[PDB]
Write a protein that binds this DNA or RNA. Structure first.
Length: 465
RNA sequence: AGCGCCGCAAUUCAUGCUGCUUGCAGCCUCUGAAUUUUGUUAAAUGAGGGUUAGUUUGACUGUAUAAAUACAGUCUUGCUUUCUGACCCUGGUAGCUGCUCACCCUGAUGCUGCUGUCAAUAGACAGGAUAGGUGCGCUCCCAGCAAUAAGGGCGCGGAUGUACUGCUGUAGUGGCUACUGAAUCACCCCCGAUCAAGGGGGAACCCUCCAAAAGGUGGGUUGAAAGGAGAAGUC
DNA sequence: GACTTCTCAACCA
DNA sequence: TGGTT
C-alpha cells in the first residue's frame, strides 16, 4: 500500500507448466474478453460522461456466466483476479479522459490478490520460505529474495502464524502484507515460456505496520474509517440479510483490531511545525535545500546539490551527458528511423532516489516535520524564466547574445526529471513521517534565497489555514 | 573561437571554527558557497560494445548518547536497478529485408576519425581502446565523404504525351532471424550447478597468542550505493 | 523517456 | 477452496 517488495519463485516444472497453461490459456483470454465485453456494453457514453463507473458492473458482466466451456478449470480467486484487473483498467481509463482497450504486452496478465491471504506460506526441510496459493495449494513454489527484503517475508509468515495460534482473533487488517502479484517476467532464450520465463511475486506492504506505534496509527485510521462506514450506512438503507452480515463483519474487524501484535518498537518521528525544509528546484542547480525555522526567521542550514549527492555528484554530469546524447539521437533518428531503446539505464531515477534520501536525512537531522516542494505545473515556466535570467547575467542588453547563449545552454543543460524527483521525495517523506507541502517558488534570486523564500511562503500560507 | 563540466589558485563569505553574552567578533584549519582568472600545477573529471543468483549498502535484541549515532550477540536468500574495478571482443555462417544513388553546386542536431607493419583510393595482419581538437565533453570546431536534412542547375536515354520515368551494381550504409566464437568474474585458480549448489586449493596485509630472537598459532580483510511494484493512457 | 490515473479486503463458509 | 459487500 506504501512499499512494494519482490522475489523470484522457483518450483517444479510441472507446477510451472500447469500455472502457465492456466494463465495464458484460461486467464488472459478471460481478461481480454472481459475488456472487450465491457467496451461493447451499452451505457458506456453515460459512464464516461458521468465519470467513474458503477462499482460492480464487471462482476455483473460475469452474469454471462464466466463458467463457459472455454473457462473451465479455474480457481475462484483467479476469476476475482481477472475482475480486479479489468475494473482497475477501466476505472483508470474513465478517469483519465475526464473505446476498446487491449493488453499492452505479450506476456500473460498478472494475478492480483486484493485479499491479504491466498499466499499461505511454509518452510520446507531445507529452510526456504515457500509459498502456495488459494485454489493452487498443490502448486508449492519456493521464494528466492534478497536479504534486504527477507525480513518482510519472514514477517508475513510470522503474522500468519500469530493469527493462526490465536484462532483468528488478530485482525487481518493489521497484517503487513496487503496484496500480491504473480507476474511473469521476460526471459532471453528459446523454449517453452515457463522454462525460459521467470515468475516473480510482488508483495504490497505498509511500512507503518513494521513498527508498533505506526501500527497504532494504522489502527486508529482503521477504527475511524470503520466507525464512519457503519454509522453512515447502518443509519439508512434499511439493510437486509446481506449487509447486516457486513455490519457484523466490520464490527468484528473493529474489535479484532485492538488485540494487537508483538511488534518492533521504534518511537515515532515527531517533527516541529516551526522548522520547514524547502527544496527549490531549478535548471542550473536541479535542487537546493534550505532548513528554515519560521518563528525566528533564521535559516538553520543550506545544502547545495553537491552537498546532498556527496560521492555521487558525478552521477549528475553523467545524467546530463546521457540526456544530451539521447536527445541528439532522438532528433537525429526522427527522420522516420527506428533505433534501439537508447538510454535504458535508470540513472535519472537513481539520482532522484539519492537526492530524495539525502533530503529526507537532512530533514530528520534538523527534526523538521515539513518538506516544502514546488508545484509540477508551475515548473514548466520556471526553467523557462530561469535560462533567460542566466543570459542577462552574461550578455546584459545583448538580445542576440541572449538568444544564442540560451540556445547553447539549453543544448548543454536540459530539464532534469522534475516530476519523479517530487514523487520520490514524497515517498521517502511519507515513509519517514515527514509532511510534504506545496509552495510558491520565487522566479528571481539565487537558489538558496529561492529555497528559503519557498519554505517561508509555504509557512505563511499554512498559518492562515 | 563558443558552450557545459572537472580540478587549481590567489579573493569575499557561511552552510563551517572558535568565545561566551547565544548573536555578536575574528580567523580560513576541516566542511562548503559565491561569473574570479588560469590549465607542467598533478587534477579531478572522461573511455566503443559485452561478461558474475558478484561484494557492501540488511532485520531482530541489548547498550552510552535527547536522538543522529558507535559497539555487542543471533539470523541471513539469490528480486529490480546505479556506479567503481578486472576481464573478453572489435567477429564467423547463412539466409532474408530496409533507405539511398545520371552528373554539378551550398553542406546537415548527417557519416567516418586509435597504434604499428604491408598496401593504391580500397583493404590484409598484428595489437587495441588515455580512439580527431581544449584538462574533459558537445547538437561546437578540423579533415575527408556526403545519395542516404532541407535547397538550386542542367544532362542524356523512354514516354501517343499533357502525366511520369531509367541511367542500379558483382553499389553504399543499416535492420531482423537462426546457428557458435570469448569473457559467466569482485583478491586469484581448479571442479560442479544455472528452476539452485556449492565444494576445494591458494596470494598479500593486519590483529590475538606461543614467544627466546628466529619461526609457529588461530581470527579478520583485499570497492561501494538505491529501491513502490503492477496495469492501463498522454505528450 | 517524462507525466497521468487506479488499485493496494477482511471475515466467514 | 470459495463467497457477498
Amino acid at each position: 500500500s506504501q512499499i512494494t517488495i519482490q522475489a523470484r519463485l522457483i518450483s517444479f516444472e510441472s507446477n510451472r507448466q500447469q500455472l502457465w497453461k492456466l494463465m495464458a490459456d484460461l486467464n488472459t483470454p478471460l481478461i481480454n474478453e472481459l475488456l472487450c465485453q465491457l467496451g461493447q456494453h451499452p451505457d458506456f457514453e453515460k459512464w464516461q460522461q458521468k465519470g467513474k463507473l458503477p462499482s460492480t458492473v464487471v462482476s455483473q458482466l460475469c452474469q454471462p456466466l464466466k463458467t463457459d466451456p472455454r473457462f473451465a478449470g479455474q480457481p475462484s480467486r483467479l476469476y476475482m483476479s481477472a475482475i480486479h484487473i479489468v475494473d482497475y483498467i477501466y476505472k483508470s481509463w474513465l478517469a483519465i479522459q475526464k473505446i476498446l482497450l487491449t493488453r499492452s504486452s505479450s506476456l500473460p496478465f498478472p494475478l492480483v490478490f486484493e485479499t491479504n491471504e491466498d499466499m499461505v506460506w511454509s518452510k520446507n526441510q531445507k529452510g526456504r520460505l515457500c509459498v502456495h496459493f488459494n485454489g493452487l495449494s498443490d502448486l508449492i513454489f519456493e521464494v528466492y529474495c534478497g536479504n534486504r527484503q527477507l525480513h518482510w517475508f519472514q514477517r508475513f509468515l510470522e503474522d500468519q502464524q500469530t493469527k493462526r495460534k490465536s484462532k483468528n482473533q488478530h485482525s487481518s487488517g493489521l497484517f503487513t502484507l496487503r496484496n500480491g502479484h504473480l507476474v511473469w517476467l521476460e526471459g532471453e532464450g528459446k523454449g517453452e515460456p515457463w522454462n525460459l520465463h521467470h515468475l516473480t511475486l510482488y508483495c504490497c506492504v505498509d511500512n507503518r505496520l513494521w513498527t508498533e506505534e505506526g501500527t497504532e496509527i494504522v489502527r486508529q485510521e482503521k477504527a475511524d474509517e470503520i466507525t464512519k462506514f457503519i454509522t453512515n450506512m447502518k443509519k439508512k438503507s434499511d439493510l437486509s440479510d446481506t449487509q447486516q452480515a457486513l455490519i457484523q463483519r466490520k464490527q468484528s474487524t473493529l474489535t479484532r483490531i485492538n488485540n494487537s501484535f508483538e511488534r518492533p518498537s521504534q518511537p515515532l518521528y515527531q517533527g516541529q511545525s516551526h522548522i520547514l525544509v524547502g527544496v527549490s528546484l531549478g535548471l542550473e542547480k536541479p535542487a537546493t535545500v534550505a532548513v528554515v525555522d519560521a518563528i525566528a526567521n533564521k535559516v538553520l542550514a543550506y545544502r547545495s546539490i553537491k552537498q546532498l549527492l556527496g560521492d555521487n555528484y558525478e552521477l549528475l554530469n553523467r545524467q546530463r551527458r546521457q540526456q544530451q546524447y539521447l536527445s541528439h539521437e532522438r532528433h537525429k533518428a526522427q527522420k522516420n528511423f527506428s533505433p534501439n531503446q537508447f538510454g535504458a539505464s535508470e540513472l535519472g531515477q537513481h539520482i532522484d532516489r539519492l537526492l530524495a534520501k539525502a533530503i529526507v536525512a537532512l530533514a530528520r537531522t534538523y527534526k523538521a516535520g515539513s518538506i516544502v516542494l514546488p508545484k509540477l505545473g508551475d515548473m514548466r515556466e520556471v526553467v523557462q524564466s530561469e535560462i533567460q535570467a542566466i543570459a542577462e547575467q552574461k550578455f546584459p542588453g545583448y538580445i542576440e547574445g541572449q538568444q544564442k547563449y540560451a540556445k547553447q545552454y539549453r543544448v548543454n543543460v536540459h530539464r532534469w526529471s522534475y516530476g519523479r524527483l517530487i514523487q520520490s521525495i514524497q515517498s521517502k517523506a511519507a515513509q519517514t513521517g515527514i509532511v510534504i507541502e506545496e509552495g510558491k517558488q520565487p522566479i528571481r534570486g539565487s537558489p538558496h534565497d529561492k529555497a528559503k523564500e519557498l519554505a517561508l511562503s509555504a509557512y505563511n500560507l499554512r498559518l492562515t489555514r
